[PDB]
From a paper:
Transcription initiation in bacteria involves the recruitment of RNAP by sigma factors (σ) to promoter regions located upstream from the transcription start site (TSS, position +1). In approximately 60% of bacteria, a major variant σ factor, σ54, forms a class of its own, lacking structural and sequence similarity to σ70. In σ54-mediated transcription initiation, σ54 recruits RNAP to genes responsible for regulating a variety of stress responses, including nutrient depletion, membrane stress, antibiotic exposure, and biofilm formation. In this study, we used single-particle cryo-electron microscopy (cryoEM) to determine the structures of initial transcribing complexes of increasing RNA lengths from 5 nt to 9 nt, which allow us to propose a mechanism of RNAP promoter escape in the σ54 system.
Author numbering:
A (entry chain A): 7 to 237, 248 to 324
B (entry chain D): 348 to 932
C (entry chain C): 548 to 944
D (entry chain D): 1279 to 1376
E (entry chain E): 2 to 75
F (entry chain C): 1094 to 1341
G (entry chain B): 4 to 238
RNA sequence: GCCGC
């Protein structure tokens, strides 16, 4: 009953600019599909970006290197814009080492196994002195969105040495997207529309692959709508009461008074517990004396009590 | 103790009783509560363990904090507390950040704006204090101001603009004469893009009336309206008439309709209606896309001609003065009058051009409707600005001088859309400096006056039910020459009559003695020709150490009569001293 | 505290504080200067016959009260004559139209009545006086950002404010640039101007990240690349909030004027996440913390790495001398300087004797008073500037 | 005080000697002068000149009795207005009955 | 959740007495020796007492008679 | 867009410089975008120099006489590479650009002369009904941040005299509940909140500990007392020749 | 980690009467609530197959403005009534019905002739309370299935005004969706806090309960993308 | 004192 769009006439203006076309569309579906695809593509598209940089002789971002024109902060800012592609890995390490005179670019980054630099003219530093050397190690990770360098705390689980410089990660290859709806050339049908999506990336991701990823994300999200339906903690407690090494005389009394766990012991006040048969003033103090050794004063107030 | 402070921002998603509390500002005010809940649940036995665990801020600590904030109200106040509405109790909502999110509808009561203000947060840590914060100082409790009786929580600015732009009519637009089965169809037509918000159509509308004794009756008919008004009709509660929607709603109809909803239905339908009004106003104001440009300030074409004529006239009177038949004072006064007349004519021409600028054709010939100019829309709707500011923006800036109180002879003939010369700007700096210096130096006088009033009236409390005195004072509408300032309705509403009210027909009793006048009684009195009503006052209560609940009329904050134990002297002092910061001395 | 008709070319009628001190604190105009006796002056152009001359006279408040002073924005022809017969003038604290021959002086320029702060507001004549006052007073509270950005719509006073302030580094005998670096510029002065003997070069040591009075950051970065000829007075490095020698204390933001779902209600501002990502409006703040070892009767105060009753985790970020390593990131209540205060005990009771036997010779008698980071303060350790007295042993660092 | 006059006259008029009752002429005072004449010396000493108010109170040997809002705030009790109105009503009946 | 306390106010109309009534009911239901007479929906004792007042089964007089009954029982 | 502001703040505050600067920044960034686009396509130096010369000669008889004829080709290349992000034009204080010059500057860069374009809602995809004024405005960042303005306290240190909490941040002080706030509380009728403010939270030395112990236990009971400040005042007045006492 | 997106769990449906429902789905990753809700609303409100009355024929006067013979209710109100009646026709593209009545009493939709294929969900719906006092009305309507909402701006059917007078140009409301509105709220899961909660408030005229309509709209929208998700599928 | 409301 409903016509289906098909990806036809995929065209690439430049390394970054590109166009994608879907020829057959119904009366109102063009704008819905265009806006959904634009939101999905701008929001969540995977990519790889620089995570941290480790330069040879520097210690912090607010320092300077003798022989280079820029500060380390501007070096990190330049490295933040590096565009790479990695196949089969998510934690590649890109080593760089160059000495001499003039600017250094991404071209002189050491050729890794499967690592592609889409733009090999990206200037990241300037060397001014003849006998000056630079050497860094760049870690590139694959991600989905914007992750600040301060929010990640799990990286502090293992101690990090003094000299590792953390940069922010963007992970999004897509920078600009527009779409238009035009009248289709199909005359046998009454009135059909066509969709043309124009996107500007950093050259990391293919247009067709991006469209497929966005459509798969949308379909996986929509899968849920097609079927709606739906219409005492501290280990010191909950231990056996025969762990306090009490007297024989109190051992019989606790059984009669239905005290079997450490926890139920601590919920009894002095006034009423003394009324229990044959406790004894001096023997009761020994129960308090032993429970004091564990730090649990007599008379605590808990909320719930499971059988175990 | 248990006090915090940070910068406030705006939260449009909030309810009238909710505020946004940062979770770092929390977990510090509620520390002992978290300790108690940790020790009670068994997570930590000793106080040291709970203290250390809160120090380490684990996840279960956040869970327990969320559990313990559940129904504990918190109260926010702003530093210059001028009246009792400057401190109110809300229900905190945990947000991530460092700024407090304040509901926009309470900003007018707080006199708060989001350009760098701060508030203070206090925790009412007692059952009695919690009940007092919930049942007395909640933001939903105080909706009418306790100084005049008008609503204090009223939509403003962007909400007013959204309501105004929503309920307008255009001569020709998408859809004309369409018949719609209900408001839902109008909303569907607008959302689908098949019609316009300002298109004129006919829609079946069902009304409700409270005419029966405590009973609601129905009424349906075909009414002539627009699409936007039909869409708005889905928000108003049942029991209200449709005449309150079929207007433009320029910040003065919306307050009146809120007041009618309060006086007819109650308190909770009123708060629900206010929240829904704010939501729909913000939504449609964002949808409109209203913006201000440099072409919105249109300058009248005849302004240059009027300027030239005025210049010729002052040249003529200067020549006449040079002839020697006029002294300095007479020519000075005549020049001032002529320039004032020229300014008035220029302003009138500019306003005439700005009012009905839009000339849009119709199905037959062409007509002239109210302009859709954005600046005129924001002025007429009352959202922001007035006529004088528009005259300064587009017409003549006018005559001004305050070096010592005199007036410069030559005026400023250039507005702000055009440039101002060096001399004209230097002249306007006089008024700017005087105004700012006056503003900075009257607050001390206002504070001293408020202190004296509060102290002289601190020990006054309603301590009796009815004194029983026959005394009173004479109430007549305030007249002054050929103008009227206060009708009897405003001066007698919510007052207890000391003597029986007689109609011009003799021996006819309308309302008995010792009765409370309200909207129905005031309307019945206005139907007849009553002119003077004898009402008792507090200066004739004759009771010792207090004031009777009958000699003092109904409290303005709540419709009912005032109850015993209400400190009225402090309320009166704050009501009198809250202005004065805006009194020009 | 009221503006006077004599405040025309001497003090600014716009720039002034708001609440307490309005009218009591003022700012000098751009061209105003102080007479020999101590009175304010302002320049004017002499007018002879009907042509304005180029010679400039400085008039005080008393002298200018007699003459007729024309307006800056009055049109003139090629030869200097007034293009219209009747021109606006100030005669004695007033404003009126005079003949083309009755004038005596003319204003030098249109900025004569505004200070430096108010000169940087484009379209000042289109703003209300008090709101422009607030804008001028708020322009001085800006915080320099990470990267400078010139204003697209400026005034032309940015160069003067940047050069005259002294934050930049300006060449004084500029020749050609020889060696460039993030912290130094060495310029080979040309032969045309040169002090005889010993040849000569110019060495500029830029000031890197340095704490300011308001705990902001002060940093200088070069503008010349290499071998680039420079002249005298050219800018070599631009200090805080300066781009290529132009005052740049803000950033160019793309703006839409529209209501958006109540998130810009009242005076609030709605900001995209892309502004956050590009690190615009990100500023560096620097803090200074100091500790002093001061002598006591019971003994001297020592700075040592080993702190009694302190775990090994706390000493991880301390060197062999007890001073943090440069670049370490400290948060919360970490220890910066390990300092120990001595305690007094000359009576060796048996319990203290066995305490000394079981543990170290001190047995932790010496109390610890170490410089710890205040709570809520975090950042990277930049510099350590240990100072020592004469005679005392030199610290390892 | 007017209230003392009205109370005293009513007691005198209730008894046989009704002619004992004294006529009075009401006075008008400013908000600054009617505040310093209050019968509670704890108030009117927290508002304006305190050396003069305390000096006159010390000589006369008067008492406060804490009958208003400001006195209870200083000594940290419940104000006799609002929710605390009921509590202050109970305390007065016990004093009357002993 | 009692957002507005209008009905509870009208049940015992002073806007000042119901604060005391709810305070004493909350003391009974929190300190001990009492249980709610309305279904507990994970709400605090204050709003539970407010809901009990609104439902028409809590007021000062019945509180006093229950207190007298418990006093006479012991 | 990067920033969204309210049109409601323009007319009442009377800032037309806002709108004029917005339009002028839009024109300047349009010229900068033209230069950047023409540099992107590796266009020859002649056409770029022609465009820059045309842009630098605009206005109605301005006094600037910048010419590219005497400019070296490398100098032209560097200057053009410096105008990719925008053309930094300048307007003096009391004389500068007018509406006509701004409009022709807009027309040079292929932008609408009205200064308003069609915006689409990024959430709904629908177009806003009216055109919206878009441009570039120079925004600063003031020195008032919430990292220095956020504070909270539950218990801390108190002064030896009057035993009340300290004041201000960096001492962990509490907010001051001044006289007007107490007037407002009295006008509300909140007597228990006021009493807990005056005694338990500030000066009742035993009351503070008792109320904290009750809160930890979960009692929510007050047990008030006598503020230390009244005792200090009594000792002060008694230190003169005047006797004041609390009779029974 | 990557490529894994949050999925809603514990969907809550609040059934109101028999045609009004409110559906809450949570959690949703930030910015997905708006996308899903807007796509669903657009599909449901602009393009949904359905059937509605598009033609009327009243014996006698045939003009758009009529004296109505005095039937206590104007013919425009008659058109407004017959517009809103919901019909579920089974297996027939177009069918024509007729209603005749007499004897003082309201004339409901049930008084129309009953056909096996048609299923009037609102037969108690009163078209008119008969002629004032006693008289007869005879009228024949026609129904057909279409898509979305098609206003009667023009007929462009048959020739001249024969089809208009035979239909009177009643607006066609094919899609059985009276009103749909969605609201996006903030929801949190564990440490994360920037997650969206989608609340869909939907009403339907009849012949369809709301959740089935939501399911149908989701089905068509998701099946539209099978040109891109078929090969790129997990299973 | 300087600044913010
Ligand atoms: Mg403000
Ligand atoms: Zn009375």
């Amino acid at each position: 009953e409903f016509l289906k769009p098909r990806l036809v006439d995929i065209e690439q203006v430049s390394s970054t600019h590109a166009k994608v076309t879907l020829e057959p569309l119904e009366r109102g579906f063009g704008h819905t599909l265009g806006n959904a695809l634009r939101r999905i593509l701008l929001s969540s598209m995977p990519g790889c970006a620089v995570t941290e940089v480790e330069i040879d002789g520097v210690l912090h971002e607010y320092s300077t290197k003798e022989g280079v024109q820029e500060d380390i902060l501007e070096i990190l800012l330049n490295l933040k814009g590096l565009a790479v592609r990695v196949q089969g890995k998510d934690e590649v390490i890109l080593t760089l080492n160059k000495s001499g005179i003039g600017p250094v670019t991404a071209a002189d980054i050491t050729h890794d196994g499967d690592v592609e630099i889409v733009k090999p003219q990206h200037v990241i530093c300037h060397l001014t002195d003849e006998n000056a050397s630079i050497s860094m190690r760049i870690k590139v990770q694959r991600g989905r969105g914007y992750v600040p360098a301060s929010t990640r705390i799990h990286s502090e689980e293992d101690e990090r040495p003094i000299g590792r410089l953390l940069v922010d990660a963007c992970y999004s290859p897509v920078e600009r997207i527009a779409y238009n709806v035009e009248a289709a050339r199909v005359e046998q049908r009454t009135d059909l529309d066509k969709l043309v999506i124009e996107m500007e990336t950093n050259g990391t991701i293919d247009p067709e692959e991006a469209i497929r990823r966005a459509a798969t994300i949308l379909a996986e999200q929509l899968e849920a709508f097609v079927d709606l339906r739906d219409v005492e903690f501290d280990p010191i407690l909950l231990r056996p009461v025969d762990d306090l090494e009490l007297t024989v005389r109190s051992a019989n009394c606790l059984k009669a008074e239905a005290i079997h766990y450490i926890g139920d012991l601590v919920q009894r006040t002095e006034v009423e517990l003394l009324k229990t048969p044959n406790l004894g003033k001096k023997s009761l103090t020994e129960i308090k004396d032993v429970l004091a050794s564990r730090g649990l004063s007599l008379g605590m107030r808990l909320e719930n009590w499971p059988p175990a | 103790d248990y006090s915090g402070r940070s910068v406030i921002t705006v939260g449009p998603y909030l309810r009238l009783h909710q505020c946004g509390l940062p979770k770092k500002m929390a977990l510090e005010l509620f520390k002992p509560f978290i300790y108690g809940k940790l020790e009670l649940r068994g997570l930590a036995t000793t106080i040291k363990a709970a203290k250390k665990m809160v120090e380490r801020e684990e996840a279960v600590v956040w869970d327990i904090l969320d559990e313990v904030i559940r129904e504990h109200p918190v109260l926010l106040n702003r530093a210059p507390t001028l009246h009792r509405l400057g401190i109110q109790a809300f229900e905190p909502v945990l947000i991530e950040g460092k700024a407090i999110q304040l509901h926009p509808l309470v900003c007018a009561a707080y006199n708060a704006d989001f350009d760098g203000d701060q508030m203070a947060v206090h925790v009412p840590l007692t059952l009695e204090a919690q009940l007092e914060a919930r049942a007395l100082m909640m933001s939903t409790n105080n909706i009418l101001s306790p100084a005049n009786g008008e609503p204090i929580i009223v939509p403003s600015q962007d909400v007013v603009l959204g309501l105004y732009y929503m309920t307008r009519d255009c001569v020709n637009a998408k859809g004309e004469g369409m018949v719609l089965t209900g408001p839902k169809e109008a909303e569907r037509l607008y959302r689908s893009g098949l019609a316009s918000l300002h298109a004129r159509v006919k829609v079946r509308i069902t009304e409700y009336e409270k005419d029966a004794n405590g009973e609601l009756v129905a009424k349906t008919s075909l009414k002539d309206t627009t699409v936007g008004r039909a869409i708005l009709w889905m928000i108003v509660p049942k029991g209200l008439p449709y005449s309150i929607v079929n207007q433009a709603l320029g910040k003065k109809a919306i307050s009146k309709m809120l007041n009618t909803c309060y006086r007819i239905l109650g308190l909770k339908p009123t708060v629900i209606f206010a929240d829904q009004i704010m939501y729909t106003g913000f939504a449609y104001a964002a949808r409109s896309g209203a913006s201000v440009g440099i072409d919105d300030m249109v300058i009248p074409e005849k302004k240059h001609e009027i300027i030239s004529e005025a210049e010729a006239e002052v040249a003529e009177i200067q020549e006449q003065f040079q002839s020697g038949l006029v002294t300095a004072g007479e020519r000075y006064n005549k020049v001032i009058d002529i320039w004032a007349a020229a300014n008035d004519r220029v302003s009138k021409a500019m306003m005439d051009n700005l009012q009905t600028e839009t000339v849009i054709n119709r199905d037959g010939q062409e007509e002239k409707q109210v302009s859709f100019n954005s600046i005129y829309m924001m002025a007429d709707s009352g959202a922001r600005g007035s006529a004088a500011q528009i005259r300064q923006l587009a017409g003549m800036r006018g005559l001004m001088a305050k070096p010592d109180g005199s007036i410069i002879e030559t005026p400023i003939t250039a507005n702000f859309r055009e440039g101002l010369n060096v001399l004209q700007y230097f002249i306007s700096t006089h008024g700017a400096r005087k105004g700012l210096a006056d503003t900075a130096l009257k607050t001390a006088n206002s504070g001293y006056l408020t202190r004296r009033l509060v102290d002289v009236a601190q020990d006054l409390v309603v301590t009796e039910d009815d004194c029983g005195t026959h005394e009173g004072i004479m109430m007549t509408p305030v007249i002054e020459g050929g103008d009227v300032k206060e009708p009897l309705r405003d001066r007698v509403l919510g007052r207890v009559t000391a003597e029986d009210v007689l109609k011009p027909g003799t021996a006819d009793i309308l309302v008995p003695r010792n009765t409370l006048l309200h909207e129905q009684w005031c309307d019945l009195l206005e139907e007849n020709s009553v002119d003077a009503v004898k009402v008792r006052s507090v200066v004739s209560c004759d009771t010792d150490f207090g004031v009777c609940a009958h000699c003092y009329g109904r409290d303005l904050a709540r419709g009912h009569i005032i109850n015993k134990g209400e400190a009225i002297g402090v309320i009166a002092a704050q009501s009198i001293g809250e202005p004065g910061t805006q009194l020009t001395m | 505290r009221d503006v006077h008709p004599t405040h025309y070319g001497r003090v600014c009628p716009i720039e002034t504080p708001e609440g307490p001190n309005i009218g009591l604190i003022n700012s000098l105009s751009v061209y105003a200067q102080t007479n020999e006796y101590g009175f304010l002056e302002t320049p004017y152009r002499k007018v002879t016959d009907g042509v304005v001359t180029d010679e400039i006279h400085y008039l005080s408040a008393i002298e200018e009260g007699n003459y007729v002073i024309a307006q800056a924005n009055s049109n003139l022809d090629e030869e200097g004559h007034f293009v219209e017969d009747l021109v606006t003038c100030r005669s004695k604290g007033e404003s009126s139209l005079f003949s083309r021959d009755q004038v005596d002086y003319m204003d030098v320029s249109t900025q004569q009545v505004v200070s430096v702060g108010a000169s940087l507001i484009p379209f000042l004549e289109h703003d209300d006086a008090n709101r422009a006052l607030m804008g001028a007073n708020m322009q001085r509270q800006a915080v320099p950002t990470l990267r400078a950005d010139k204003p697209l719509v400026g005034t032309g006073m940015e160069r003067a404010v940047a050069v005259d302030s002294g934050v930049t580094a300006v060449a004084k005998r500029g020749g050609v640039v020889q060696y460039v670096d993030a912290s130094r510029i060495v310029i080979k002065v040309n032969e045309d101007e040169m002090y005889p003997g010993e040849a000569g070069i110019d060495i500029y040591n830029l000031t890197k990240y340095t704490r300011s009075n308001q705990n902001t950051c002060i940093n200088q970065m070069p503008c010349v690349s290499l071998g680039e000829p420079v002249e005298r007075g050219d800018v070599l490095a631009d200090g805080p909030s300066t781009d290529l020698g132009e005052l740049a204390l803000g950033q160019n933001m793309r703006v839409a004027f529209m209501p958006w779902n109540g998130y810009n209600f009242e005076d609030s501002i709605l900001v995209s996440e892309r502004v956050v990502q590009e690190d615009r409006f990100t500023t560096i703040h620097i803090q200074e913390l100091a500790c002093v070892s001061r002598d006591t009767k019971l003994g001297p105060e020592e700075i040592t790495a080993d702190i009694p009753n302190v775990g090994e985790a706390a000493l991880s970020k301390l060197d062999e001398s007890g001073i943090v390593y440069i670049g370490a990131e400290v948060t919360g209540g970490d220890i910066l300087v390990g300092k120990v205060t001595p305690k007094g005990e000359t009576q060796l009771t048996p319990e203290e004797k066995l305490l000394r036997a079981i543990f170290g010779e001190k047995a932790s008698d010496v109390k610890d008073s170490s410089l710890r980071v205040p709570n809520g303060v975090s950042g990277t350790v930049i510099d350590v500037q240990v100072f020592t007295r004469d005679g005392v042993e030199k610290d390892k660092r | 005080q007017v209230e003392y006059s009205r109370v005293k006259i009513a007691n005198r008029e209730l008894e046989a000697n009704g002619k004992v009752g004294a006529t009075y002429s009401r006075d008008l005072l400013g908000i600054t002068k009617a505040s310093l004449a209050t019968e509670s010396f704890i108030s009117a000493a927290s508002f304006q000149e305190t050396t003069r108010v305390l000096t006159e109170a010390a000589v006369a040997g008067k008492r406060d009795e804490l009958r208003g809002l400001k006195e209870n705030v200083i000594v940290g009790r419940l104000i006799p207005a609002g929710t605390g109105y009921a509590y202050h009503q109970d305390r007065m009946r016990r004093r009357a009955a002993g | 959740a009692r957002v507005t306390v209008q009905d509870a106010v009208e049940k015992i109309g002073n806007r000042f007495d119901l604060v005391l009534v709810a305070a004493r009911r909350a003391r009974q239901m929190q300190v001990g020796g009492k249980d709610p007479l309305v279904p507990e929906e994970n709400d605090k004792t204050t709003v539970i007492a407010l809901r009990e007042i609104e439902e028409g089964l809590i007021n000062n007089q019945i509180l006093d008679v229950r207190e007298r009954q418990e006093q006479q029982e012991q | 867009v990067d920033i969204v502001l309210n049109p409601l703040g323009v007319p009442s505050r009377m800032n037309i410089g806002q709108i004029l600067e917005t339009h002028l920044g839009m024109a300047a960034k349009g010229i900068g975008d033209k230069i950047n686009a023409m540099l992107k396509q590796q266009q020859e130096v002649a056409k770029l120099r022609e465009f820059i010369q045309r842009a630098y000669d605009l206005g109605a008889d301005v006094r600037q006489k910048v010419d590219l004829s005497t400019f070296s080709d490398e100098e032209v290349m560097r200057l053009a590479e410096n105008l990719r992000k925008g053309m930094p034009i300048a307007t003096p204080v009391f004389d500068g650009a007018k509406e006509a010059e701004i409009k022709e500057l807009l027309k040079l860069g292929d932008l609408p002369t009205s200064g308003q374009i069609r915006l689409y809602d990024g959430r709904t995809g629908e177009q806003f009904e009216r055109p919206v004024t878009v441009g570039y405005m120079y925004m600063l960042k003031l020195n008032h941040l919430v990292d220095d303005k956020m504070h909270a306290r539950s218990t801390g240190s108190y002064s030896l005299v009057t035993q009340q909490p300290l004041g201000g941040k960096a001492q962990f002080g509490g907010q001051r509940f001044g006289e007007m706030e107490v007037w407002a509380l009295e006008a509300y009728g909140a007597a228990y909140t006021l009493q807990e403010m005056l005694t338990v939270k500030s000066d009742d030395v035993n009351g503070r500990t008792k109320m904290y112990k009750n809160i930890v236990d979960g009692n929510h009971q007050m047990e008030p007392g006598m503020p230390e400040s009244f005792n200090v005042l009594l000792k002060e007045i008694r230190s003169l020749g005047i006797n004041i006492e609390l009779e029974d």
